[PDB]
Design a protein around this ligand. Structure first.
Ligand code: HEM
Ligand code: HEM
Ligand code: OT4
Ligand code: OT4
Ligand code: H4B
Ligand code: H4B
Ligand code: ZN
Lengths: 412, 413
């Protein structure tokens, strides 16, 4: 049970001991594997639920600074112990906060970009009290992370849950996303994935330009209050016009995308403490836009339009016109970003980086939890090295977790 | 207990009750998922054999709507006495056919299972020698091939008894190309087959030493040392690969065989183990175009193809690899269709499987599926299986992996 993982392209074999420190459960059993389930499974921590969680976290922390078993360690354990017995919760030291966040990223088994995990910019926003205040922290995040196209990793951490009545939440799924409107006649204009949220905004007071690439407004909820709309200043939203380096007609498709991927609907858990609002951001892998955002049938779905322009034989599937078109689109996305000097990585580069990162983690940590179903890119799978890499998936803490959408729960 | 799966593209939700009939184990635990391990670890006595027999017979007679009948009870009784008396038992023909078909049906890594009920089962349980094996296999190949109009088939050799008298096909597939390790480090032919090739040569094979030499059959009967046989070339249907627009593609000198026929797996039915049971269907295009040609550890022709297309091969973000892969796959499909050899593209096959899967949820209560393997090795998310949640669990009858015989065999000499 000190498990081994093989790379079948290189015969490299790695021994995993880190999985033995796993806390939470996977959702698999000896009888059934649920590795392809998108999301397997009021609850405020009780007093005695929280001490062991806090102790577990402080133990890793003081080991990581080579102070395990020290006076400083013991003192802190005691101090937090006292504070929970007293206040029914506790507060992280800035240093612990930063360690917790960086390690939540390190432990994210579905993330392929984790080779960068130690270079995360952490913005402490725990002094925040209002949606306007939240708006301000978020604008600063966006401007810092964007950095004129030279993107930088960042997370902004708002106050922690207390009793579930005073939660901080960003209602958008990403800080920057295009709107989606269902036409009265056909299907959808803009981005179909955002049709419900685009409507909640409107139903909350937003006036929409009803274009195909309208940046959504922010819906910000502080201390469990009704949320508020804020438009992100356009000069803070860096966008890229999409053109092909060979096909002049590509520009005429009229497509663009934003440079900053910034997920804002997940929950960060450290030492038992729950941060329900913690937007984090990095930079795109090319296929996230080109393969998923543009070509998914339930998104922009521009494949047929493009194949048309290329004059491919769309009569039978065995001509592989979708594949051919798909490649060109993704060539264009990378070409556009690179030309405009906005940070982006191709799926070949990022998967190779991740193999290197796996190597490092097995060597200096004893393993690296990884979710094959998510790590392997949605195109050209087997000509990337992660395809032939066996991976073990297990859940370590600190972690990012999913949480219900606010509008289904909000005590309005 | 119910279990739901969701298709995230169509929002279709299905309910799995079949997983409750699962007996075997996955390799996963409460705290670890081993879903991407290629071969998880996941001589049998009468102690454990009659429960296994009873389970199978209960299934079998349920499917034919005779559960609890006299024919069912007498059959149970007959199998019981045969086991306590002889320490094994024999399957009737009907049972064997049901067995092989349900094994395929239960094969969670197989995207082609829509076809599972149309399997041609050849009973070679009266075979006793390697020569007899060679003859059964020749006939399999002739029948399956059918002049390019392929037919699914399986040939079943005698079951294991004491594990000292096993029937084995030492080839991983009935038809495969040689691989030769050259002194300078390079490989001639198929790198996947170098080790098996070396065995054949040792056993007295005279190697042509080309890049597409069909390997000889290495056949073991009754636990005896294996013998070489050459498949008659008129029986091996091959297809030269050309591209519909690139005239220089044919000059790359590629070809591939038409019949995929896997011969190293173990068929388990009602506790009985059939260690030699070659089965065949037809190719999905990506098996050849993506894995056989473009894997770095295989023929690895991406470079040569990228050069002739004059692609920007300097930085990878030009996606020259991705572009070359598509053209090669286009060529493979075009060539097979032109020669009227049965083949299916990954778009058609994944679509068929989603239909199969839905049908299996309705009429059977589930469909075990291994996402890691079902999703095609190129253009993943534009196929409908990518967005489909799947539960993976093991049912019997089943096909299992077994170790290479040259590692476990006791040599006679
Ligand atoms: C810096 C470059 C980064 C790249 C290239 C990257 C790439 C990716 C990709 C491709 C996915 C799959 C999601 C999808 O396909 O839609 C993913 C998921 C994810 N990423 Fe990263 N990411 C980066 C930075 C970050 C950062 C800075 C964080 C947090 C601090 C992060 C946390 C996560 C998490 C939590 C998931 C989902 C994990 C889960 O659901 O368990 N990523 N990332
Ligand atoms: C008729 C057309 C068929 C097609 C297109 C097809 C396709 C495939 C493919 C692509 C794989 C994955 C192999 C790889 O990617 O390396 C697979 C796996 C498999 N197939 Fe099929 N197959 C077909 C017929 C059959 C038949 C006739 C049988 C047996 C009677 C069979 C049994 C299996 C088994 C046992 C596996 C591995 C399953 C496991 O380990 O769970 N298939 N199939
Ligand atoms: C920081 C970051 C960068 C990036 N390029 N992609 C991300 C993708 C995610 C992500 C996580 C869960 C689900 C999703 C959307 C599902 N395809 C995205 C989260 C963060 C990301
Ligand atoms: C009958 C049949 C047809 C087909 N097109 N592919 C198969 C592929 C397999 C197969 C199963 C496990 C492993 C492998 C090779 C390793 N990728 C192939 C087995 C049977 C097949
Ligand atoms: C059903 C399946 O689990 C789902 O489509 C997953 C598959 N793999 C993925 N992988 C990545 N990187 N992103 C995704 O959104 C998904 N979707
Ligand atoms: C390590 C990994 O599980 C291994 O490379 C698997 C991945 N998925 C696959 N899927 C198919 N269809 N065929 C394969 O050979 C593999 N190989
Ligand atoms: Zn699992």
């Amino acid at each position: 049970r000190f498990l081994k993982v093989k790379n079948w392209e290189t015969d490299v074999v790695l021994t995993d001991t880190l999985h033995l420190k796993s806390t939470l459960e996977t959702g698999c059993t000896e009888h059934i594997c649920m590795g392809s389930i998108m999301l397997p499974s009021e609850d405020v921590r009780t007093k005695d639920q929280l001490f062991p969680l806090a102790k577990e976290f402080l133990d890793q922390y003081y080991s990581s600074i080579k102070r395990f078993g020290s006076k400083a360690h013991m003192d802190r354990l005691e101090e937090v112990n006292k504070e929970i017995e007293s206040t029914s919760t506790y507060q992280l030291k800035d240093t612990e906060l930063i360690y917790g966040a960086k390690h939540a990223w390190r432990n994210a088994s579905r993330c392929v970009g984790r080779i960068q995990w130690s270079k995360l910019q952490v913005f402490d926003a725990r002094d925040c009290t209002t949606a306007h205040g939240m708006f301000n922290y978020i604008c600063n995040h966006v401007k810092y992370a964007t950095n004129k196209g030279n993107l930088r990793s960042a997370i902004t951490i708002f106050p922690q849950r207390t009793d579930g009545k005073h939660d901080f939440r960003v209602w958008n799924s990403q800080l920057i996303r295009y709107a989606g409107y269902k036409q009265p006649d056909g299907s959808t204009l803009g981005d179909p994935a955002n049709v419900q949220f685009t409507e909640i905004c409107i139903q909350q007071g937003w006036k929409a330009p009803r274009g195909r690439f309208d940046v959504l407004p922010l819906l910000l909820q502080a201390n469990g209050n009704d949320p508020e709309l804020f438009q992100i200043p356009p000069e803070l939203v860096l966008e890229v016009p999409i053109r092909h380096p060979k096909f002049d007609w590509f520009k005429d498709l009229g497509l663009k995308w934003y440079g900053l991927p910034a997920v804002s609907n997940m929950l960060l858990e450290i030492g038992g403490l729950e941060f329900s609002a913690c937007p984090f951001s990095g930079w795109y892998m090319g296929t996230e836009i080109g393969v998923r955002d543009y070509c998914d049938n339930s998104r922009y779905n521009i494949l047929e339009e493009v194949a048309k322009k290329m004059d491919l034989d769309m009569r039978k599937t065995s001509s592989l016109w979708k594949d051919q078109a798909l490649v060109e689109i993704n060539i264009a996305v990378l070409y556009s970003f690179q030309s405009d000097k906005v940070t982006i990585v191709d799926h070949h580069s990022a998967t190779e980086s991740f193999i290197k990162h796996m190597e490092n983690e097995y060597r200096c940590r004893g393993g690296c939890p990884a979710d094959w179903v998510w790590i392997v890119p949605p195109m050209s799978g087997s000509i990337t090295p992660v395809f032939h890499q066996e991976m073990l998936n297990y859940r370590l803490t600190p972690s990012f977790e999913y949480q219900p959408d606010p509008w289904n729960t909000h005590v309005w």
